[PDB]
PDB file of C-alpha atoms and ligand atoms in Angstrom:
ATOM      1  CA  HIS A   6     246.148 142.795 167.194  1.00  0.00           C
ATOM      2  CA  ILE A   7     245.285 143.718 163.548  1.00  0.00           C
ATOM      3  CA  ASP A   8     242.786 141.405 161.725  1.00  0.00           C
ATOM      4  CA  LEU A   9     244.995 140.682 158.650  1.00  0.00           C
ATOM      5  CA  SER A  10     242.508 138.255 156.973  1.00  0.00           C
ATOM      6  CA  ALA A  11     240.330 141.385 156.299  1.00  0.00           C
ATOM      7  CA  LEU A  12     243.001 142.896 153.951  1.00  0.00           C
ATOM      8  CA  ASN A  13     241.815 143.211 150.309  1.00  0.00           C
ATOM      9  CA  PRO A  14     243.473 140.541 148.013  1.00  0.00           C
ATOM     10  CA  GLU A  15     243.708 142.959 145.001  1.00  0.00           C
ATOM     11  CA  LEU A  16     245.395 145.565 147.282  1.00  0.00           C
ATOM     12  CA  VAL A  17     247.683 142.778 148.723  1.00  0.00           C
ATOM     13  CA  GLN A  18     248.828 142.034 145.093  1.00  0.00           C
ATOM     14  CA  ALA A  19     249.417 145.824 144.569  1.00  0.00           C
ATOM     15  CA  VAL A  20     251.421 146.357 147.824  1.00  0.00           C
ATOM     16  CA  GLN A  21     253.419 143.099 147.136  1.00  0.00           C
ATOM     17  CA  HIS A  22     256.710 144.888 146.150  1.00  0.00           C
ATOM     18  CA  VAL A  23     256.582 146.736 149.558  1.00  0.00           C
ATOM     19  CA  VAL A  24     255.477 143.695 151.660  1.00  0.00           C
ATOM     20  CA  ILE A  25     258.124 141.716 153.604  1.00  0.00           C
ATOM     21  CA  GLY A  26     256.952 138.308 154.911  1.00  0.00           C
ATOM     22  CA  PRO A  27     257.419 137.677 158.689  1.00  0.00           C
ATOM     23  CA  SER A  28     259.591 134.545 158.046  1.00  0.00           C
ATOM     24  CA  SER A  29     262.080 136.730 156.024  1.00  0.00           C
ATOM     25  CA  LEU A  30     262.626 139.173 158.947  1.00  0.00           C
ATOM     26  CA  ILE A  31     264.318 138.802 162.348  1.00  0.00           C
ATOM     27  CA  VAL A  32     263.964 141.791 164.725  1.00  0.00           C
ATOM     28  CA  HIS A  33     266.429 142.023 167.668  1.00  0.00           C
ATOM     29  CA  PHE A  34     264.007 143.796 170.106  1.00  0.00           C
ATOM     30  CA  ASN A  35     266.729 143.861 172.833  1.00  0.00           C
ATOM     31  CA  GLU A  36     268.876 146.094 170.537  1.00  0.00           C
ATOM     32  CA  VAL A  37     267.522 149.708 170.496  1.00  0.00           C
ATOM     33  CA  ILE A  38     269.367 151.834 167.842  1.00  0.00           C
ATOM     34  CA  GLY A  39     266.845 154.696 167.602  1.00  0.00           C
ATOM     35  CA  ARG A  40     264.031 156.219 169.680  1.00  0.00           C
ATOM     36  CA  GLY A  41     261.108 158.376 168.585  1.00  0.00           C
ATOM     37  CA  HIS A  42     257.592 159.345 169.783  1.00  0.00           C
ATOM     38  CA  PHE A  43     256.000 157.079 167.112  1.00  0.00           C
ATOM     39  CA  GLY A  44     258.188 154.072 168.048  1.00  0.00           C
ATOM     40  CA  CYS A  45     261.618 152.556 168.750  1.00  0.00           C
ATOM     41  CA  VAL A  46     264.101 151.468 166.025  1.00  0.00           C
ATOM     42  CA  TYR A  47     265.760 148.040 166.447  1.00  0.00           C
ATOM     43  CA  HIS A  48     268.643 146.098 164.867  1.00  0.00           C
ATOM     44  CA  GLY A  49     267.145 143.798 162.228  1.00  0.00           C
ATOM     45  CA  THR A  50     268.117 140.894 159.961  1.00  0.00           C
ATOM     46  CA  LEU A  51     266.432 140.558 156.555  1.00  0.00           C
ATOM     47  CA  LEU A  52     266.787 137.384 154.489  1.00  0.00           C
ATOM     48  CA  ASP A  53     267.284 137.464 150.655  1.00  0.00           C
ATOM     49  CA  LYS A  58     271.670 138.000 155.256  1.00  0.00           C
ATOM     50  CA  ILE A  59     271.003 141.783 155.116  1.00  0.00           C
ATOM     51  CA  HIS A  60     271.437 144.067 158.150  1.00  0.00           C
ATOM     52  CA  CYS A  61     268.523 146.522 158.635  1.00  0.00           C
ATOM     53  CA  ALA A  62     266.831 149.029 160.993  1.00  0.00           C
ATOM     54  CA  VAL A  63     263.278 148.099 161.996  1.00  0.00           C
ATOM     55  CA  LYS A  64     260.755 150.638 163.309  1.00  0.00           C
ATOM     56  CA  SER A  65     257.623 149.498 165.218  1.00  0.00           C
ATOM     57  CA  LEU A  66     254.918 152.012 164.174  1.00  0.00           C
ATOM     58  CA  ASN A  67     252.686 152.633 167.237  1.00  0.00           C
ATOM     59  CA  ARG A  68     250.215 154.873 165.280  1.00  0.00           C
ATOM     60  CA  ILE A  69     248.670 151.880 163.367  1.00  0.00           C
ATOM     61  CA  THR A  70     246.396 149.895 165.757  1.00  0.00           C
ATOM     62  CA  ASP A  71     243.443 148.915 163.437  1.00  0.00           C
ATOM     63  CA  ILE A  72     242.830 147.265 159.970  1.00  0.00           C
ATOM     64  CA  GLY A  73     241.019 150.447 158.806  1.00  0.00           C
ATOM     65  CA  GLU A  74     244.405 152.294 158.964  1.00  0.00           C
ATOM     66  CA  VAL A  75     246.433 149.436 157.301  1.00  0.00           C
ATOM     67  CA  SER A  76     245.422 150.180 153.638  1.00  0.00           C
ATOM     68  CA  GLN A  77     246.539 153.858 153.995  1.00  0.00           C
ATOM     69  CA  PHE A  78     249.713 152.780 155.861  1.00  0.00           C
ATOM     70  CA  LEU A  79     250.552 150.364 152.973  1.00  0.00           C
ATOM     71  CA  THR A  80     249.992 153.221 150.427  1.00  0.00           C
ATOM     72  CA  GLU A  81     252.413 155.459 152.413  1.00  0.00           C
ATOM     73  CA  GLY A  82     254.809 152.498 151.851  1.00  0.00           C
ATOM     74  CA  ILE A  83     254.342 152.614 148.025  1.00  0.00           C
ATOM     75  CA  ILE A  84     254.887 156.446 147.969  1.00  0.00           C
ATOM     76  CA  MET A  85     257.966 156.121 150.260  1.00  0.00           C
ATOM     77  CA  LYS A  86     259.565 153.213 148.274  1.00  0.00           C
ATOM     78  CA  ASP A  87     259.182 155.331 145.071  1.00  0.00           C
ATOM     79  CA  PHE A  88     261.492 157.921 146.778  1.00  0.00           C
ATOM     80  CA  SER A  89     264.507 155.772 145.760  1.00  0.00           C
ATOM     81  CA  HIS A  90     267.745 157.722 145.234  1.00  0.00           C
ATOM     82  CA  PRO A  91     271.447 157.224 146.266  1.00  0.00           C
ATOM     83  CA  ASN A  92     271.157 160.185 148.717  1.00  0.00           C
ATOM     84  CA  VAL A  93     267.699 159.498 150.196  1.00  0.00           C
ATOM     85  CA  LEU A  94     266.930 156.823 152.848  1.00  0.00           C
ATOM     86  CA  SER A  95     265.251 153.986 150.844  1.00  0.00           C
ATOM     87  CA  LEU A  96     262.468 151.844 152.416  1.00  0.00           C
ATOM     88  CA  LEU A  97     263.243 148.082 152.027  1.00  0.00           C
ATOM     89  CA  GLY A  98     259.615 147.248 152.851  1.00  0.00           C
ATOM     90  CA  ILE A  99     256.904 146.729 155.489  1.00  0.00           C
ATOM     91  CA  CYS A 100     256.209 143.713 157.744  1.00  0.00           C
ATOM     92  CA  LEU A 101     252.525 143.210 158.726  1.00  0.00           C
ATOM     93  CA  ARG A 102     252.167 141.245 161.993  1.00  0.00           C
ATOM     94  CA  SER A 103     249.070 139.453 163.408  1.00  0.00           C
ATOM     95  CA  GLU A 104     250.396 140.438 166.895  1.00  0.00           C
ATOM     96  CA  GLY A 105     251.973 143.856 167.468  1.00  0.00           C
ATOM     97  CA  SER A 106     252.305 147.165 165.594  1.00  0.00           C
ATOM     98  CA  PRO A 107     253.361 147.076 161.846  1.00  0.00           C
ATOM     99  CA  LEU A 108     257.123 147.064 161.116  1.00  0.00           C
ATOM    100  CA  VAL A 109     258.898 149.605 158.848  1.00  0.00           C
ATOM    101  CA  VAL A 110     262.088 148.007 157.379  1.00  0.00           C
ATOM    102  CA  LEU A 111     264.849 150.521 156.595  1.00  0.00           C
ATOM    103  CA  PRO A 112     268.499 149.986 155.525  1.00  0.00           C
ATOM    104  CA  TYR A 113     270.924 149.994 158.491  1.00  0.00           C
ATOM    105  CA  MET A 114     273.064 153.160 158.698  1.00  0.00           C
ATOM    106  CA  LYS A 115     276.461 152.024 160.160  1.00  0.00           C
ATOM    107  CA  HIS A 116     277.517 155.572 161.051  1.00  0.00           C
ATOM    108  CA  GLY A 117     274.101 156.782 162.325  1.00  0.00           C
ATOM    109  CA  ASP A 118     272.970 160.409 162.036  1.00  0.00           C
ATOM    110  CA  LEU A 119     275.265 162.932 160.307  1.00  0.00           C
ATOM    111  CA  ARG A 120     275.203 165.356 163.279  1.00  0.00           C
ATOM    112  CA  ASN A 121     276.602 162.824 165.806  1.00  0.00           C
ATOM    113  CA  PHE A 122     279.103 161.607 163.150  1.00  0.00           C
ATOM    114  CA  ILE A 123     280.666 165.102 162.663  1.00  0.00           C
ATOM    115  CA  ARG A 124     280.553 165.883 166.408  1.00  0.00           C
ATOM    116  CA  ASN A 125     282.518 162.702 167.273  1.00  0.00           C
ATOM    117  CA  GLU A 126     286.078 163.755 168.235  1.00  0.00           C
ATOM    118  CA  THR A 127     287.541 160.368 167.067  1.00  0.00           C
ATOM    119  CA  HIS A 128     286.642 161.362 163.454  1.00  0.00           C
ATOM    120  CA  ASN A 129     289.095 163.469 161.429  1.00  0.00           C
ATOM    121  CA  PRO A 130     287.061 165.194 158.631  1.00  0.00           C
ATOM    122  CA  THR A 131     288.706 167.524 156.132  1.00  0.00           C
ATOM    123  CA  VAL A 132     287.057 170.598 154.479  1.00  0.00           C
ATOM    124  CA  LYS A 133     286.568 168.384 151.339  1.00  0.00           C
ATOM    125  CA  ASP A 134     284.737 165.591 153.346  1.00  0.00           C
ATOM    126  CA  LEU A 135     282.349 168.065 155.004  1.00  0.00           C
ATOM    127  CA  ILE A 136     281.621 169.898 151.733  1.00  0.00           C
ATOM    128  CA  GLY A 137     281.152 166.416 150.168  1.00  0.00           C
ATOM    129  CA  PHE A 138     278.492 165.629 152.825  1.00  0.00           C
ATOM    130  CA  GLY A 139     276.748 168.965 151.993  1.00  0.00           C
ATOM    131  CA  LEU A 140     276.863 168.127 148.252  1.00  0.00           C
ATOM    132  CA  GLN A 141     275.326 164.672 148.882  1.00  0.00           C
ATOM    133  CA  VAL A 142     272.545 166.296 150.972  1.00  0.00           C
ATOM    134  CA  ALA A 143     271.986 168.840 148.095  1.00  0.00           C
ATOM    135  CA  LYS A 144     271.709 165.840 145.653  1.00  0.00           C
ATOM    136  CA  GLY A 145     269.095 164.012 147.813  1.00  0.00           C
ATOM    137  CA  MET A 146     267.138 167.296 148.197  1.00  0.00           C
ATOM    138  CA  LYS A 147     267.335 167.973 144.381  1.00  0.00           C
ATOM    139  CA  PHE A 148     265.586 164.570 143.898  1.00  0.00           C
ATOM    140  CA  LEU A 149     262.962 165.250 146.611  1.00  0.00           C
ATOM    141  CA  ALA A 150     262.192 168.771 145.250  1.00  0.00           C
ATOM    142  CA  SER A 151     261.801 167.234 141.728  1.00  0.00           C
ATOM    143  CA  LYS A 152     259.055 164.966 143.273  1.00  0.00           C
ATOM    144  CA  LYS A 153     257.453 168.142 144.810  1.00  0.00           C
ATOM    145  CA  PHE A 154     258.218 166.769 148.275  1.00  0.00           C
ATOM    146  CA  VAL A 155     258.742 169.391 151.030  1.00  0.00           C
ATOM    147  CA  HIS A 156     260.892 167.971 153.881  1.00  0.00           C
ATOM    148  CA  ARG A 157     260.057 170.699 156.555  1.00  0.00           C
ATOM    149  CA  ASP A 158     262.630 169.168 158.988  1.00  0.00           C
ATOM    150  CA  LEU A 159     265.960 169.240 157.107  1.00  0.00           C
ATOM    151  CA  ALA A 160     268.878 169.195 159.588  1.00  0.00           C
ATOM    152  CA  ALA A 161     272.134 167.258 160.128  1.00  0.00           C
ATOM    153  CA  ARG A 162     270.362 165.165 162.884  1.00  0.00           C
ATOM    154  CA  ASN A 163     267.825 164.076 160.147  1.00  0.00           C
ATOM    155  CA  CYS A 164     270.411 162.811 157.651  1.00  0.00           C
ATOM    156  CA  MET A 165     272.013 159.381 157.979  1.00  0.00           C
ATOM    157  CA  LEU A 166     275.452 157.979 157.082  1.00  0.00           C
ATOM    158  CA  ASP A 167     276.070 154.461 155.716  1.00  0.00           C
ATOM    159  CA  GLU A 168     279.194 152.166 155.639  1.00  0.00           C
ATOM    160  CA  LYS A 169     280.450 153.858 152.391  1.00  0.00           C
ATOM    161  CA  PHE A 170     280.065 157.366 153.964  1.00  0.00           C
ATOM    162  CA  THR A 171     277.079 157.995 151.648  1.00  0.00           C
ATOM    163  CA  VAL A 172     274.687 160.559 153.143  1.00  0.00           C
ATOM    164  CA  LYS A 173     270.977 159.705 153.049  1.00  0.00           C
ATOM    165  CA  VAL A 174     268.365 162.445 153.575  1.00  0.00           C
ATOM    166  CA  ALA A 175     266.054 160.742 156.072  1.00  0.00           C
ATOM    167  CA  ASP A 176     263.232 161.456 158.603  1.00  0.00           C
ATOM    168  CA  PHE A 177     260.319 161.383 156.094  1.00  0.00           C
ATOM    169  CA  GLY A 178     257.344 159.172 155.179  1.00  0.00           C
ATOM    170  CA  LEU A 179     256.859 156.189 157.532  1.00  0.00           C
ATOM    171  CA  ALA A 180     260.252 157.023 159.202  1.00  0.00           C
ATOM    172  CA  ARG A 181     259.020 160.575 160.184  1.00  0.00           C
ATOM    173  CA  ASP A 182     259.693 161.287 163.910  1.00  0.00           C
ATOM    174  CA  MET A 183     261.392 163.504 166.537  1.00  0.00           C
ATOM    175  CA  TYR A 184     264.551 161.322 167.052  1.00  0.00           C
ATOM    176  CA  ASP A 185     266.408 163.987 169.082  1.00  0.00           C
ATOM    177  CA  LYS A 186     264.849 163.913 172.624  1.00  0.00           C
ATOM    178  CA  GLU A 187     266.434 167.353 173.456  1.00  0.00           C
ATOM    179  CA  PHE A 188     263.716 169.004 171.253  1.00  0.00           C
ATOM    180  CA  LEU A 199     259.168 173.576 166.299  1.00  0.00           C
ATOM    181  CA  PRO A 200     262.764 173.315 164.723  1.00  0.00           C
ATOM    182  CA  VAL A 201     262.775 177.158 164.704  1.00  0.00           C
ATOM    183  CA  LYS A 202     266.597 177.564 164.314  1.00  0.00           C
ATOM    184  CA  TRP A 203     266.384 175.758 160.916  1.00  0.00           C
ATOM    185  CA  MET A 204     263.181 177.529 159.788  1.00  0.00           C
ATOM    186  CA  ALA A 205     262.917 180.210 157.064  1.00  0.00           C
ATOM    187  CA  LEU A 206     261.734 183.676 158.101  1.00  0.00           C
ATOM    188  CA  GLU A 207     258.402 183.281 156.176  1.00  0.00           C
ATOM    189  CA  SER A 208     257.744 179.828 157.777  1.00  0.00           C
ATOM    190  CA  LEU A 209     258.305 181.240 161.337  1.00  0.00           C
ATOM    191  CA  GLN A 210     255.725 183.951 160.440  1.00  0.00           C
ATOM    192  CA  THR A 211     253.107 182.094 158.293  1.00  0.00           C
ATOM    193  CA  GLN A 212     253.620 178.411 159.419  1.00  0.00           C
ATOM    194  CA  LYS A 213     253.810 177.583 155.619  1.00  0.00           C
ATOM    195  CA  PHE A 214     256.635 175.416 154.197  1.00  0.00           C
ATOM    196  CA  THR A 215     258.004 175.118 150.611  1.00  0.00           C
ATOM    197  CA  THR A 216     261.100 173.804 148.806  1.00  0.00           C
ATOM    198  CA  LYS A 217     262.394 177.447 149.211  1.00  0.00           C
ATOM    199  CA  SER A 218     262.055 177.066 153.013  1.00  0.00           C
ATOM    200  CA  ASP A 219     263.921 173.680 152.750  1.00  0.00           C
ATOM    201  CA  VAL A 220     266.701 175.683 150.967  1.00  0.00           C
ATOM    202  CA  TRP A 221     266.937 177.899 154.133  1.00  0.00           C
ATOM    203  CA  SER A 222     267.171 174.750 156.396  1.00  0.00           C
ATOM    204  CA  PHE A 223     269.869 173.427 153.981  1.00  0.00           C
ATOM    205  CA  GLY A 224     271.960 176.591 154.505  1.00  0.00           C
ATOM    206  CA  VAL A 225     271.683 175.941 158.276  1.00  0.00           C
ATOM    207  CA  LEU A 226     272.696 172.256 157.648  1.00  0.00           C
ATOM    208  CA  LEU A 227     275.834 173.535 155.721  1.00  0.00           C
ATOM    209  CA  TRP A 228     276.707 175.655 158.805  1.00  0.00           C
ATOM    210  CA  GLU A 229     276.277 172.507 161.027  1.00  0.00           C
ATOM    211  CA  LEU A 230     278.696 170.622 158.755  1.00  0.00           C
ATOM    212  CA  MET A 231     281.401 173.341 158.818  1.00  0.00           C
ATOM    213  CA  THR A 232     281.172 173.797 162.611  1.00  0.00           C
ATOM    214  CA  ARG A 233     281.216 169.974 163.122  1.00  0.00           C
ATOM    215  CA  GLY A 234     277.693 169.866 164.644  1.00  0.00           C
ATOM    216  CA  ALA A 235     277.678 173.019 166.767  1.00  0.00           C
ATOM    217  CA  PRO A 236     274.124 174.158 167.823  1.00  0.00           C
ATOM    218  CA  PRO A 237     272.953 177.079 165.600  1.00  0.00           C
ATOM    219  CA  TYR A 238     272.608 180.541 167.240  1.00  0.00           C
ATOM    220  CA  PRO A 239     274.419 179.619 170.542  1.00  0.00           C
ATOM    221  CA  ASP A 240     273.298 182.536 172.861  1.00  0.00           C
ATOM    222  CA  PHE A 244     265.281 183.437 172.469  1.00  0.00           C
ATOM    223  CA  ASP A 245     262.758 184.631 169.789  1.00  0.00           C
ATOM    224  CA  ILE A 246     264.513 183.691 166.509  1.00  0.00           C
ATOM    225  CA  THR A 247     262.220 185.898 164.291  1.00  0.00           C
ATOM    226  CA  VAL A 248     263.133 189.123 166.190  1.00  0.00           C
ATOM    227  CA  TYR A 249     266.866 188.045 166.223  1.00  0.00           C
ATOM    228  CA  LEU A 250     266.817 187.525 162.394  1.00  0.00           C
ATOM    229  CA  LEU A 251     264.848 190.781 161.696  1.00  0.00           C
ATOM    230  CA  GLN A 252     267.602 192.816 163.497  1.00  0.00           C
ATOM    231  CA  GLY A 253     269.623 192.076 160.311  1.00  0.00           C
ATOM    232  CA  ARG A 254     271.422 188.940 161.486  1.00  0.00           C
ATOM    233  CA  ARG A 255     272.587 185.569 160.138  1.00  0.00           C
ATOM    234  CA  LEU A 256     274.838 182.751 161.439  1.00  0.00           C
ATOM    235  CA  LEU A 257     278.541 183.734 161.442  1.00  0.00           C
ATOM    236  CA  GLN A 258     281.036 182.245 159.016  1.00  0.00           C
ATOM    237  CA  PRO A 259     282.509 179.084 160.562  1.00  0.00           C
ATOM    238  CA  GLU A 260     286.319 179.269 160.986  1.00  0.00           C
ATOM    239  CA  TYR A 261     286.942 176.402 158.503  1.00  0.00           C
ATOM    240  CA  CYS A 262     284.187 177.424 156.069  1.00  0.00           C
ATOM    241  CA  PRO A 263     285.573 178.612 152.675  1.00  0.00           C
ATOM    242  CA  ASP A 264     284.372 182.107 151.482  1.00  0.00           C
ATOM    243  CA  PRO A 265     282.357 180.769 148.420  1.00  0.00           C
ATOM    244  CA  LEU A 266     280.489 178.238 150.653  1.00  0.00           C
ATOM    245  CA  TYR A 267     279.609 181.026 153.124  1.00  0.00           C
ATOM    246  CA  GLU A 268     278.338 183.068 150.089  1.00  0.00           C
ATOM    247  CA  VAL A 269     276.173 180.013 149.205  1.00  0.00           C
ATOM    248  CA  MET A 270     274.859 179.894 152.851  1.00  0.00           C
ATOM    249  CA  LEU A 271     273.863 183.616 152.612  1.00  0.00           C
ATOM    250  CA  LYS A 272     272.041 182.948 149.316  1.00  0.00           C
ATOM    251  CA  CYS A 273     270.115 180.074 151.062  1.00  0.00           C
ATOM    252  CA  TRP A 274     269.032 182.662 153.673  1.00  0.00           C
ATOM    253  CA  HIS A 275     267.860 185.331 151.168  1.00  0.00           C
ATOM    254  CA  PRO A 276     264.928 187.274 152.743  1.00  0.00           C
ATOM    255  CA  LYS A 277     262.935 186.704 149.484  1.00  0.00           C
ATOM    256  CA  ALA A 278     262.139 182.975 149.157  1.00  0.00           C
ATOM    257  CA  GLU A 279     261.904 183.256 145.298  1.00  0.00           C
ATOM    258  CA  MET A 280     265.513 184.674 145.283  1.00  0.00           C
ATOM    259  CA  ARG A 281     266.968 181.565 147.046  1.00  0.00           C
ATOM    260  CA  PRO A 282     268.841 179.114 144.804  1.00  0.00           C
ATOM    261  CA  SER A 283     267.047 175.942 143.712  1.00  0.00           C
ATOM    262  CA  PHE A 284     268.544 172.602 144.894  1.00  0.00           C
ATOM    263  CA  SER A 285     269.662 172.086 141.265  1.00  0.00           C
ATOM    264  CA  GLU A 286     271.748 175.337 141.497  1.00  0.00           C
ATOM    265  CA  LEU A 287     273.101 174.232 144.966  1.00  0.00           C
ATOM    266  CA  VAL A 288     274.320 170.833 143.549  1.00  0.00           C
ATOM    267  CA  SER A 289     276.058 172.804 140.717  1.00  0.00           C
ATOM    268  CA  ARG A 290     277.661 175.508 142.936  1.00  0.00           C
ATOM    269  CA  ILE A 291     278.706 173.087 145.712  1.00  0.00           C
ATOM    270  CA  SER A 292     280.114 170.524 143.223  1.00  0.00           C
ATOM    271  CA  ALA A 293     282.415 173.317 141.838  1.00  0.00           C
ATOM    272  CA  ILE A 294     283.619 174.356 145.402  1.00  0.00           C
ATOM    273  CA  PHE A 295     284.096 170.655 146.423  1.00  0.00           C
ATOM    274  CA  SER A 296     286.238 170.006 143.266  1.00  0.00           C
ATOM    275  CA  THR A 297     288.814 172.669 144.329  1.00  0.00           C
ATOM    276  CA  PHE A 298     289.753 170.736 147.523  1.00  0.00           C
ATOM    277  CA  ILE A 299     292.198 167.801 147.852  1.00  0.00           C
ATOM    278  CA  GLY A 300     291.584 166.692 151.461  1.00  0.00           C
ATOM    279  CA  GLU A 301     294.552 168.510 153.039  1.00  0.00           C
ATOM    280  CA  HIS A 302     292.576 170.916 155.355  1.00  0.00           C
ATOM    281  CA  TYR A 303     291.536 169.343 158.697  1.00  0.00           C
ATOM    282  CA  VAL A 304     288.412 170.851 160.343  1.00  0.00           C
ATOM    283  CA  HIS A 305     288.685 171.208 164.098  1.00  0.00           C
ATOM    284  CA  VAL A 306     286.074 171.745 166.811  1.00  0.00           C
ATOM    285  CA  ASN A 307     285.490 175.329 168.021  1.00  0.00           C
ATOM    286  CA  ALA A 308     286.476 175.870 171.712  1.00  0.00           C
ATOM    287  CA  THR A 309     283.391 178.155 172.245  1.00  0.00           C
ATOM    288  CA  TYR A 310     281.025 175.431 170.822  1.00  0.00           C
ATOM    289  CA  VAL A 311     282.375 172.396 172.813  1.00  0.00           C
ATOM    290  CA  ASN A 312     279.680 171.033 175.227  1.00  0.00           C
ATOM    291  CA  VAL A 313     277.232 173.847 174.264  1.00  0.00           C
ATOM    292  CA  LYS A 314     273.733 172.231 174.546  1.00  0.00           C
TER     293      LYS A 314
HETATM  294  C1  LIG B   1     269.901 161.099 166.778  1.00  0.00           C
HETATM  295  N1  LIG B   1     269.179 160.268 165.840  1.00  0.00           N
HETATM  296  C2  LIG B   1     268.674 160.610 164.607  1.00  0.00           C
HETATM  297  C3  LIG B   1     268.064 159.489 164.117  1.00  0.00           C
HETATM  298  C4  LIG B   1     267.338 159.357 162.846  1.00  0.00           C
HETATM  299  C5  LIG B   1     267.169 160.463 161.949  1.00  0.00           C
HETATM  300  C6  LIG B   1     266.450 160.318 160.786  1.00  0.00           C
HETATM  301  C7  LIG B   1     265.883 159.052 160.493  1.00  0.00           C
HETATM  302  N2  LIG B   1     265.159 158.588 159.486  1.00  0.00           N
HETATM  303  C8  LIG B   1     264.917 157.254 159.791  1.00  0.00           C
HETATM  304  C9  LIG B   1     265.477 156.906 160.990  1.00  0.00           C
HETATM  305  C10 LIG B   1     265.487 155.592 161.704  1.00  0.00           C
HETATM  306  C11 LIG B   1     266.826 154.884 161.553  1.00  0.00           C
HETATM  307  C12 LIG B   1     267.211 154.295 160.319  1.00  0.00           C
HETATM  308  C13 LIG B   1     268.453 153.625 160.199  1.00  0.00           C
HETATM  309  C14 LIG B   1     269.313 153.488 161.317  1.00  0.00           C
HETATM  310  N3  LIG B   1     270.496 152.826 161.181  1.00  0.00           N
HETATM  311  C15 LIG B   1     271.331 152.759 162.248  1.00  0.00           C
HETATM  312  C16 LIG B   1     271.041 153.346 163.504  1.00  0.00           C
HETATM  313  C17 LIG B   1     269.806 154.021 163.661  1.00  0.00           C
HETATM  314  C18 LIG B   1     268.920 154.090 162.563  1.00  0.00           C
HETATM  315  C19 LIG B   1     267.690 154.791 162.678  1.00  0.00           C
HETATM  316  N4  LIG B   1     266.109 158.042 161.456  1.00  0.00           N
HETATM  317  N5  LIG B   1     266.819 158.136 162.620  1.00  0.00           N
HETATM  318  C20 LIG B   1     268.192 158.515 165.148  1.00  0.00           C
HETATM  319  N6  LIG B   1     268.894 158.988 166.167  1.00  0.00           N
HETATM  320 CL1  LIG B   2     290.432 169.771 152.222  1.00  0.00          CL
END
């Protein structure tokens, strides 16, 4: 129960491009499509008929938090890019938690998509997914935004097989109940708890490994820092081309400043991608099946 009459009119006029009126939105509360600690995600219907994903944000319980929440909406909507999950808007209710309106992702998270045995990806498709992720991250890094939780489970896939870097802003949550994401963290971040775009480049190398293994868990077989400092990295996936594994190794350079930028990753990966024609099918590794 948020006292909405208290909201500042001048601020209301400023948040207008992010505000979705309650009469324009239908939330199917009986249809759970996502679950996180900060709220459930439901099938939604937005008018002027558009399919959407609606998150009920449990953190916002008072009018004093609404102004800041609406500003997080402005910042998040300005992160508009073909390869980044784009906020459609926010729905402020007089009864119940505020609603975060996101585009519906037909194929869900990228990790479950690649893991699904009814899908037949080629080396080109998987590299294409990595390239799209690199493109969304190039945009985010250009805005000085540090993801800190880049992984295949945190990227989404739409009806056109377009990858959207997600899990940020108002949509930030732990959507994988099995889970901090140490196996995706750079050596310096595990040690100093500090994150940068260079540490997102390390996570991206791990995401490339997830793509090539079709969603295998990284490091299957517990202190990751000590494991890495023995002089170890993830093995080359069976279907991973040599130049892409060389790119992975560059992403995991011990010196953060020596890691490629996301601009260099888009460039290098676009070249590798271009050499493929979609004739090499990527299969699941027998030693990775059911490992969780
Ligand atoms: C295993 N797993 C991962 C997620 C995930 C990851 C990142 C992210 N950023 C915003 C959202 C919420 C969302 C957005 C669109 C959806 N479309 C269709 C279906 C669910 C949707 C959920 N997520 N969800 C959910 N389950
Ligand atoms: Cl191919």
